Structure formats: structure tokens, C-alpha cells
């Protein structure tokens, strides 16, 4: 098994040891906070880590379906 990532990778694929069960979407920004709206740092989850004052952290519950909008000429 495994999950997707986004972080310091261009992209990569890992999940955490058997405890986590799904993959998540940490919405925030870069330290550069570039003109692309929201950075999303995908990875391993057991529950959906969402906050309220900034961190949207939604999920996907099945294989590969983790990500957001990205792969478009924009």
C-alpha cells in the first residue's frame, strides 16, 4: 500500500505505518506565498486533520484520489 505526497518533493508517494488509513489535503501557502492561491501538502491520515482559522484539511477515502485542481495550463 501507499499514499501520495506533496511537500519538498516535486511529487512523491508514501504513507505512514499501519495506523493511518487514508490520505489528506493541508491547504496553506509557501514562505514565498506565490501568485497560485493555495499550496496543498498531501500525505498520510487516520482522521481528517481540519482546523478553522486557516487549515482546511479534507480527505480522500480510496486509492490515488487524494489531490486538488492543479494539472491545467494556467
Amino acid at each position: 500500500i501507499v499514499c501520495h505526497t506533496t511537500a519538498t518533493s516535486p511529487i512523491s508517494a508514501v504513507t505512514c505505518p499501519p495506523g493511518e488509513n487514508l490520505c489528506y489535503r493541508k491547504m496553506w501557502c509557501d514562505a514565498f506565498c506565490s501568485s497560485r492561491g493555495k499550496v496543498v501538502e498531501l500525505g498520510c491520515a487516520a482522521t481528517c486533520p481540519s482546523k478553522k482559522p486557516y487549515e482546511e484539511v479534507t480527505c480522500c477515502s480510496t486509492d490515488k484520489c487524494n489531490p486538488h485542481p492543479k494539472q491545467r495550463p494556467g
Binding site: 511529487i11 491547504m27 509557501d30 506565490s34 493555495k38 485542481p69 492543479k70 494539472q71
Partner: peptide, 14 residues
Amino acid sequence: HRYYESSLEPWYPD
């Protein structure tokens, strides 16, 4: 170089 919500490539994202 980033995985924002507008691109995935380190050319379009940043």
C-alpha cells in the same frame, strides 16, 4: 517549484 492549486509542475506552479 511547488504543488499549489493551479499547477503541479515546478514550472507552472512556481
